[PDB]
């Protein structure tokens, strides 16, 4: 129960929800990819593509670094969770 106040898992909440709106094409695939951005533990950029709404499912526990307003880092564990339907949800845990 912590307000997600991270931009990176904030953008990415809104794609969650993006996706759950989405209709897939036959056989599954999104009609067109979703990049996401985050920063992972070791502070560098990485951008994913996600071709199906599943695909959501494997940045679920991932260890992300994100930059406070103050500009100190912070490590989260990024969680994603299908709560009916293949209907995700996207938000955090605290690394340490
Ligand atoms: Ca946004």
Do not use: C, W
Not at 24 to 52: F, W
Not at 69 to 95: A, C, M, P, S
Request: no cysteine; aromatic share 6%; charged share 25%.
């Amino acid at each position: 129960g912590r307000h997600v106040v991270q931009q990176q898992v904030q953008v990415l909440q809104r794609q969650a929800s993006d996706i759950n709106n989405t209709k897939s094409l036959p056989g599954g695939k999104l009609p067109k990819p979703v990049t996401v951005k985050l920063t992972d533990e070791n502070g560098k950029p990485q951008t994913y593509t996600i071709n199906r709404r599943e695909d959501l499912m494997k940045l679920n526990g991932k260890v992300l670094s994100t930059k406070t307003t103050l500009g100190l880092e912070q490590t989260f564990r990024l969680r994603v969770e299908d709560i009916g339907g293949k209907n995700y949800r996207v938000f955090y845990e605290t690394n340490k």
